[PDB]
Amino acid sequence: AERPTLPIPDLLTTDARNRIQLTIGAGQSTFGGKTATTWGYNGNLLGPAVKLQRGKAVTVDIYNQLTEETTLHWHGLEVPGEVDGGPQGIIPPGGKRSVTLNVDQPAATCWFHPHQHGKTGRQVAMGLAGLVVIEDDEILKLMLPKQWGIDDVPVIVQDKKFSADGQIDYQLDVMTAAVGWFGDTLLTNGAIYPQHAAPRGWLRLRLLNGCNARSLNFATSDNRPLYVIASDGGLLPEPVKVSELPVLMGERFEVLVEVNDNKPFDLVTLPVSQMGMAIAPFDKPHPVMRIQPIAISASGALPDTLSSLPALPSLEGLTVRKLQLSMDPMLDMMGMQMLMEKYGDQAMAGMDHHMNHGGKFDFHHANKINGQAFDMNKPMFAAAKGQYERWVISGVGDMMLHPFHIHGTQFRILSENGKPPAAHRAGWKDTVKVEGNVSEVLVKFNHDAPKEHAYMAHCHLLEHEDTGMMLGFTVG
Ligand SMILES: [Cu+2]
Ligand SMILES: [Cu+2]
Ligand SMILES: [Cu+2]
Ligand SMILES: [Cu+2]
Numbered sequence: 001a002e003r004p005t006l007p008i009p010d011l012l013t014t015d016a017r018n019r020i021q022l023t024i025g026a027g028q029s030t031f032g033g034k035t036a037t038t039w040g041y042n043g044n045l046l047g048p049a050v051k052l053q054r055g056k057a058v059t060v061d062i063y064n065q066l067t068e069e070t071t072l073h074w075h076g077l078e079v080p081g082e083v084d085g086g087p088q089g090i091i092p093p094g095g096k097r098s099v100t101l102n103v104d105q106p107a108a109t110c111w112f113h114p115h116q117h118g119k120t121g122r123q124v125a126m127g128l129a130g131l132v133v134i135e136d137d138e139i140l141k142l143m144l145p146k147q148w149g150i151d152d153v154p155v156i157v158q159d160k161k162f163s164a165d166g167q168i169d170y171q172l173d174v175m176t177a178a179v180g181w182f183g184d185t186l187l188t189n190g191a192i193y194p195q196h197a198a199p200r201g202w203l204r205l206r207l208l209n210g211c212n213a214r215s216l217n218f219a220t221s222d223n224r225p226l227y228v229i230a231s232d233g234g235l236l237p238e239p240v241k242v243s244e245l246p247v248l249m250g251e252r253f254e255v256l257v258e259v260n261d262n263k264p265f266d267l268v269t270l271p272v273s274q275m276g277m278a279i280a281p282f283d284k285p286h287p288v289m290r291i292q293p294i295a296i297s298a299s300g301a302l303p304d305t306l307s308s309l310p311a312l313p314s315l316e317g318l319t320v321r322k323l324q325l326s327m328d329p330m331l332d333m334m335g336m337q338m339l340m341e342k343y344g345d346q347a348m349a350g351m352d353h354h355m356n357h358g359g360k361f362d363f364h365h366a367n368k369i370n371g372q373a374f375d376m377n378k379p380m381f382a383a384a385k386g387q388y389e390r391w392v393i394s395g396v397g398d399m400m401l402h403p404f405h406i407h408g409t410q411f412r413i414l415s416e417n418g419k420p421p422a423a424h425r426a427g428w429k430d431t432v433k434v435e436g437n438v439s440e441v442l443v444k445f446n447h448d449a450p451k452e453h454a455y456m457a458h459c460h461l462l463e464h465e466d467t468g469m470m471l472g473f474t475v476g
Contacts, residue, residue, distance in 0.1 A: 002195070003193055003194055003195040003290055004191050004192075004194045004195070005194055005195060005196065005197070006153065006155075006188060006189055006191065006194040006195065006196040006289055007046075007189040007190055007191055007194070008148070008149035008153060008154070008189070009046065009047065009048050009049045009130070009131055009154060009156075009189065010042070010048045010049065011048070011049045011051050011133065011148050012042075012048045012049065012050050012051060013051045014058050014059075017059075018057070018058055018059055019058075019059050019060070019061055020050060020058060020059070020060045020061070021042075021060075021061050021063070022041050022042060022047070022048075022050075022060060022061070022062045022063070022072070022130075023041065023042055023063045023065055024039070024040075024041055024062065024063065024064045024065055024066055024070055024072075024091075024128065025039065025040065025044075025065035025066065026038070026039050026044075026065075026066060026126075027039075027040065027043070027044030027045075028044060029044050029045045029127070029190065031160075031162065031166070031185065031187075031192065032185075032192065034162070034166035035166055036162065036166050036167050036168055037126075037167060037168070038126060038127035038168070039066065039123070039126040039127040039128050040127050040128065041112075041128060041130045044127070045127045045190045046127060046128075046129055046130065046156060046189065046190050047112070047128070047129060047130025047131070048130055048131070049130065049131035049132070049133050049148075049154060050112070050130065050131070050132050050133070051133045051135070052077075052101065052103045052132060052133065052134045052135070053103060053134070053135055053136070054103050054104060054105065054106065054107070054134065054135070054136035054137075055103065055104065055136075056103060057100055057101065057102045057103070058100070058101055058103070059098055059099070059100045059101075060072075060098065060099050060100075060101065061096060061098045062091060062096065062097050062098065062099070063095075063096045064091040064092065064093055064094065064095055064096070064097075065093075065094065066093055067093045067094075068093055068116075068119075069090050069091065069092060069093060069116060070090075070091055070114045070116050070123060070128070071085045071086065071087060071088075071089040071090060071091060071114055071115040071116055072085045072089070072091065072097075072099075072112055072113075072114065072115075073085035073086055073089070073112060073113060073114070073115040073407075074101070074110060074112050074132060075110060075111050075112060075113060075250060075405070075430070076108060076109075076110030076111065076132065076232055076233060076252070076410070076430050077101065077103070077105070077110050077132060077134075078104065078105045078408060078409060078410065078446055078447060079101055079102070079408070079447060080447040080448050080449060080453075081407075081408065081447070081448065081449025081450060081453040081454055081455050081474070081475070082449075082450070082453045083099040083100065083101060084407055084408065084449065084453065084455060084456075085099070085112075085115055086115050086407065086453070086454065086455065086456045086472070087115055087116065087117040087376055087456070088376065088452060088453050088454065089115065089453065103134060104446070105134065105233070105234070105410060106134070106136055106138070106139075106233070106234040106235065106307070106428070107134050107135050107136040107138065107139035107230075107234055107235065108134045108230065108232070108233050108234035108235075108252075108410075108428070109131065109132070109133060109134075109154070109206040109208070109230065109252045109254055110131070110132035110134060110232075110252070111129060111130065111131050111132060111156075111208055111210070111250075111252065112129070112130045112131070112132060113128060113129045113130070113210075114128050115456070117376060118364070118466050118467075119466065120462050120465055120466055121170070121172060121176075121181055121212050121462035121463050121465070121466050122170050122172065124210070124212060124462060125160065125168060125170040125181060125212055125462075126168060126170065127168075127190075129156060129158075129208075129210045131154050131156070131206070131208070133206075134234075138235075138307060139235065142301065142303050142306060143299075143300065143301045143303070144202075144204060144229070144256075144300050144301060144302075144303075145201075145202050145203060145204035145256065145298060145299075145300030145301075146204075146300065150198070150199065151198060151199055151201070151202065151203050151204060151298045151299075151300055152204045152206070152300075153196060153198075153203070153204070153205060153206070154189065154205075154206045154208065155188060155189065155205045155206060155207050155208065155267070155288070155289065156187075156188070156189050156190075156208045156210045157186065157187070157188055157207070157208065157209060157210065157211070157216060157247075157269065157288055158186070158187045158210040158211050159182055159183040159184070159185060159186050159187070159211050159214050160183045160185050160187060161182070161183030161184050161185060162183075162185065169183075172364075172463055172466055172467070173363075174331060174334050174335045174338060174363050175335045175338040175339055175342070176213075176335070176463045177331060177335060177363045177364075177366060177367065177463050177464070177466075177467045178327065178331060178332050178334070178335025178336055178339070178400070179213070179275050179276045179335055179336065179339050179400065179463075180212055180213020180214070180276065180461050180462070180463050180464070181212045181213055181462070181463055182211070182212070182213050182214045182276055182277060184279070184280075184281065184282075186269070186286055186288065188288050188289045193287050193288075193289065193290070194289050194290070195289065195290040195291075195292050196289055196290070196291055196292065197292045197293075197294050198259045198291055198292070198293060198294065198298070199259065199293075199294050199296045199297060199298035200259055200260065200261055200293060200294065200295060200296065200297055200298055201258070201259060201297055201298030201299070201300060202256045202257070202258065202259070202298055202300045202301070202302055203256065203257050203258075203259050203291065203298065204229075204254060204255070204256055204300065205254065205255050205256075205257065205267070206252065206254050207245070207247060207252060207253050207254070207255065208250075208251075208252050209247040209248060209249050209250065209251055209252075210249075210250075211249050212249065212461070212462040212463065213249060213276075213461045213462065213463060214249070214272075214274070214277050214282075215246065215247070215248050215249065215272045215274050215277065215401060215403075216246070216247045216269045216272065217244050217245065217246045217247070217269055217270040217271075217272050218244065218245040218247060218255075218267060218268070218269055218270075218288070219243060219244040219245070219267075219268055219269075219270055219285070220257065220265050220266065220267060220268065221265050221266040221267075221268055221285070221287070222263070222265045223243065224257060224258055224265065225241050225242065225243055225257075226241075226242050226243075226245055226255040226256075226257055227239040227240070227241055227242075227255055227256040227257070227302055228240045228241075228242055228245065228253055228254070228255050228424040229254050229255065229256060229302075229306055230252075230253065230254035230306075230427075231251075231252070231253055231424065231425065231427050231428055231429055232251055232252050232253075232410065232428060232429050232430040232431060233410030233411075233427070233428025233429060233430060234307070234410070234427070234428050235306040235307040235427070236306055236307070236309070236423075236424060236426075236427045237305065237306060237307055237308060237309040237427065238304065238305050238306055239256070239302060239303075239304075239306065240423045240424040242424060244270060245424075246272070248401075248403035248431055248433060248460070249403050249431075249460045249461060249462070250403060250405055250430075250431055250460040251403065251429075251430075251431045253424070256300075256302050257291070259291060259293045259298065260293060261293050261295050262293065263293060264290055264291060264292050264293060265290075265291055266287045266288065266289065266290050266291070267287070267288040267289050267291065268285040268286060268287050268288055269282075269285070269286050269288055270285050271283055271284065271285070271349075271350055272350070273350040273351055273352075274401050275336070275339065275347060275348060275351065275399075275400070275401075276339055276343070276347050278346065278349040278350050279343050279346055279347065280346075283346065283349060309426075309427055312412060312414070312442060313388060313442075315390060315414075315442075318387075318388055318389055318390050318442075319384065319387070319389045319390065320389075320390045320391075320392060321381065321383075321389060321390070321391045321392065322370070322392050322394070323369055323370060323391060323392065323393045323394070323404075323457065323471070324369065324370050324371070324394050324397075325367075325368070325369055325393065325394060325395045325397075325398075325402050325404070325434060325459065325469060326367070326368050326369075326371070326397050326398065327366065327367050327368075327397075327398045327400065327464075327469075328363075328366035328367070328368075329398075330361075331363045331366040332398055332400070335363075363467060364466075364467050364468070365467065365468045366467055366468060367459075367464045367465075367467045367468040367469035368468050368469060369457075369458075369468075369469060369470065369471045370471070372468075372471070373467070373468025373469075374458075374465075374468045374469070374470040374471060374472070375472075376472065378472070379451055379454045379471075379472040379473050379474045380471040380472065380473060381473050381474075382473065382474045382475070383445055383455075383473050383474070383475050384445070384475070385445055385446070385447070385448060385475045385476045386444065386445070386446065387444065387445075388442055388443070388444045389442075389443055389444070390414070390440055390441070390442060390443075391406065391411075391440070391441050391443055391457075392438060392439070392440045393432065393434050393438070393439045393440075393441070394434070394437075394438045394439075395417075395434040395435055395436055395437065395438075396436065396437065396438065398436070399435065399436045400435070400461070400464070401433070401435045401461060402433075402434040402435065402459040402461060402464065402469070403431045403432070403433060403434075403459065403460045403461065404431065404432050404433075404434045404439065404457070404458070404459055404460070405430055405431045405457070405458060405459075405460045406430065406441070406443055406455070406457045407449075407455040407456045407457065408445050408447060408449060408455040408475060409430070409443045409444060409445055409446075410428040410429065410430055411428070411429055411430065411432075411441040411442055411443040411444075412426070412427075412428070412429070412441065412442040413425060413426065413429055413432050413439065413440075413441050413442075414440040414441060414442055415438065415439055415440040416432055416433050416439055417432075417433045417434060417435055417436075417437040417438070417439055418437040418438055418439075429441075431460060434459075445475040447475065447476075448475050448476035449473070449474050449475045449476070450474060450476075451472075451474055454472035454473060454474050455472065455473050455474070455475060456470055456471070456472060456473075457470070457471050457472075457473060458470030458471070
């Protein structure tokens, strides 16, 4: 049979009352011909792309039609804590919450997802994620590929696994609390190995790693390069040519790739050096989508310059914050042992060369920052507003992968896991790799966040977050 076409999320803008309506609900999807219960925003799975303009406010009405509580966070958007949608931003089942977003950051591809306390991994795994397209006056002048669903397309890449009855097989247990929830099936905007018909010339892909725990590494099947034009928080100063593009959980990159007549190619993901993630079929390059060239000229450009990136400022005298990530050694050892017993040596491929003892020993609070599993009631510190700070995040002490995300900002990486950042990671980022080593970022918070609606800082390996690897902080 033919490949399904790549689903394209609807690009949503405000009504005359300046409102966007998002309904959160459950329905059915089909994978490999089997029905599964799934959750979506304005539909059964995944979500729309909300279009925002810098300097304009919009109001979002969010209707929770689930039978459990949820929250809605705008990952990558710089907004006050009151509308950030972290764990404190509860929307009761059957209820509605509205937020007004005053967009004040450069053009970028952001996304939105639940942030329910202790349950974010399950709610994302069940289907909830959407996109945010921010535009500003600067990016349209570049004449990039811009026809949504034709030469400008979002690519949300996620793994799942399913039980024999067809349902999503999600569990937060001792194994996944240590190494993450991952599966054997790869979805691309919700579809298994779709094709996308693209015109001849440049194709813009807005890539999102929407996996709970799996890192990805994009490349093309015939080794044509990818031209990175933007990261999490917006355009790079100029395109950066790469042959492969690692993408951590929750990160976005936009790339341009050439489309030539008569030569279809796949976007693929290459095996990564992360525990658990190279089990067949991920032990080999895995297709993500087929690009099918169409003999119609694409009008988009790849300009030599994209934007102006300001210099880093002097670092002397800035507040330095230490964030020590950690995992309880016993539950790290027990979850890694369960991974190895289940899959054997292949669970470490590509890597470098039972009774109840009480609540003190519960894996649900085994992962921590600065010695503390996430306490919704006690922000760990008060950060300055309108001030640059240097945050130092260490994963020394274990070897798991921790893509560390800070709400309320787009930062600059100074050191990524002990090395200067790669050029395409040197611009605006909301995520930094921490793995066995130390990262340092330069952050500034432009908006307030009070104790009652604090900003989160956390590992974006969702099962780590849900079992304590998160802190709250206030601003202002
Ligand atoms: Cu976020
Ligand atoms: Cu996030
Ligand atoms: Cu982590
Ligand atoms: Cu978050």
